[PDB]
Write a protein that binds this DNA or RNA. Structure first.
Length: 290
DNA sequence: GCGACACAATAAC
DNA sequence: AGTTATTGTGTCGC
């Protein structure tokens, strides 16, 4: 009924089929590590301004809620939240040096303003994009939005337990204790240590995330989860690391920039999950039906 | 099959 | 040692 796997940090992931077993909404059993991600490809090279050294980049993503491993499939529920977190790392550059440096795209050099992550959902069989929606904790009593592009600086990915612990914090004292895990406050650095051209100072806002945390995410309510044959559709979640540049023939999305003008999110690397099954609202997907 | 509202279990405090 | 928050899901009604 419950299959248990040990996570990297010693917590457990407890996989169960909601067709057979109903567990409380806030049970720790709802938190579990989802499918592993795989490299799709690398795109535009990034080099340091003077040294010319190529920046080695790696997305570090994890799903922490919403997916179960059931008979060799990864299964989510349309009605329910998932959590997808990601950082990135730069194997050949420590953070403190990285923030003081400047970087160009090798396309022919475009200056990188900042690094960012976005997520997408796709039909894994035909590459069609599928809309994602997010809620606040207030859900229907608050706004709905689509996942946004998240400026980030490189950081290790927090342990599964840390994401759990930080999922619904309001208390100021606890917020302070997790602050350094999730944010860099540029307004707190010594500005005298940085050149005008430094990467840190081309980030759009003073509060800079170290971790992209997409919580309370769902596939759009209008998604069809079955093919016409009644076979399950296969979906995939994608994480894309990009460099944002000033647009003043390679893969990129347009981006509503800080100063209002046109911006360019130039793809650097992309990872995705293996195929995912999503169970719809049908009564037969729930243990209540039995 | 979807938007909306309802209920209720365990976290958060 | 209480109250309020969050979220899986039951149900309504079109």
């Amino acid at each position: 009924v419950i299959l248990t796997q040990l996570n990297e940090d010693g917590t457990t992931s407890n996989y169960f089929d909601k067709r057979k077993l109903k567990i409380a909404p806030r049970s720790t059993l709802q938190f579990k590590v989802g499918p592993p991600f795989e490299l799709v490809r690398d795109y535009c090279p990034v080099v340091e301004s003077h040294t010319g050294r190529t920046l080695d980049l790696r997305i570090i993503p994890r799903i922490d809620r919403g997916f179960d491993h059931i008979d060799e499939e990864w299964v989510g529920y349309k009605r329910n939240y998932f959590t997808l977190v990601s950082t990135f790392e730069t194997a050949n550059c420590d953070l403190d040096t990285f923030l003081k440096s400047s970087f160009d795209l090798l396309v022919g050099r475009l200056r990188v303003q900042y690094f960012a992550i976005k997520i997408k959902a796709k039909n894994d069989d035909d590459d069609t994009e599928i809309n994602l929606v997010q809620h606040t904790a207030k859900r229907d009593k608050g706004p709905q939005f689509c996942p946004s592009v998240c400026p980030l600086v490189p950081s290790p990915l927090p342990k599964h337990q840390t994401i759990r612990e930080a999922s619904n914090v309001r208390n100021i004292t606890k917020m302070k204790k997790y602050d350094s895990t999730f944010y860099l406050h540029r307004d707190h650095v010594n500005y005298e240590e940085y050149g005008v051209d430094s990467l840190l100072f081309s980030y759009p806002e003073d509060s800079i995330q170290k971790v992209a945390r997409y919580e309370r995410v769902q596939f759009a309510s209008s998604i069809s989860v079955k093919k016409p044959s009644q076979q399950n559709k296969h979906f995939s979640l994608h994480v894309i690391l990009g460099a944002v540049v000033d647009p003043d023939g390679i893969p990129y999305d347009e981006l509503a920039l800080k100063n209002g003008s046109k911006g360019m999110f130039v793809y650097l690397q992309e990872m995705k999950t293996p195929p995912l099954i999503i169970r719809g609202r049908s009564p037969s997907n729930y243990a209540s039906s039995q």
